[PDB]
Amino acid sequence: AGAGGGELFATHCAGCHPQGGNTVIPEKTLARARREANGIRTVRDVAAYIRNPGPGMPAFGEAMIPPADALKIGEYVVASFP
Ligand code: HEM
């Protein structure tokens, strides 16, 4: 609906990744070096990951996070979590 990546992140992601952390599996934060060690480097990598993520994270399909919104989330993640 034209929401920005940060707003989408606050709604859908920050309940388990507040400030880019991880409240479920603490080592698995969004910090750049950590996520990139598991292959999550680009905007598109983030957008694809949320469709089929690791255990303990729900999948986010296109009905709840449309493709354009998934890319905006990816942009936010890459920009915000060094
Ligand atoms: C919201 C859409 C959202 C995003 C974006 C997101 C991202 C994300 C990444 C990039 C990782 C790192 C994976 C890696 O292997 O390094 C990651 C990992 C986990 N997440 Fe997440 N996440 C989003 C949402 C949520 C929500 C709402 C939860 C909690 C219910 C959650 C949880 C987790 C867990 C657990 C992991 C670790 C998975 C693993 O392989 O061990 N995420 N997330």
Author numbering: 23 to 104
Task: Show sentences the authors wrote.
The protonatable site of the imidazole ring of histidine 47 (His47) has been hypothesized as the redox-Bohr center based: (i) on the typical pKa value for a histidine side chain and (ii) on its spatial location near the heme in the structure of OmcF. To test this hypothesis, in the present work, we used site-directed mutagenesis to replace the His47 by isoleucine (OmcFH47I) and phenylalanine (OmcFH47F) residues. In both cases, the side chain of the substituting residues is not protonatable and, therefore, will permit the evaluation of the contribution of His47 to the observed redox-Bohr effect. In addition, the crystal structure of the OmcFH47I mutant was determined. The crystal structure of OmcFH47I mutant determined at a high resolution also showed that the mutation did not affect the structure. The global folding of the mutants was assessed by NMR spectroscopy and the comparison of the polypeptide and heme NMR signals showed that both the mutants were properly folded and that only local conformational changes were observed in the vicinity of the mutated residue regions. Electrochemical cyclic voltammetry studies carried out for both the mutants, within the physiological pH range, showed that the redox potential values and the redox-Bohr effect were smaller compared to the wild-type cytochrome. This unequivocally confirms the role of His47 in the pH modulation of the OmcF heme redox potential and electron/proton transfer mechanisms. However, the redox-Bohr effect was not fully abolished in the mutants (approximately 30% less in the mutants) suggesting the existence of another redox-Bohr center in OmcF, which was attributed to the heme propionate P13. Therefore, these two acid–base groups with pKa in the physiological range (heme propionate P13 and His47) contribute to the overall observed redox-Bohr effect.
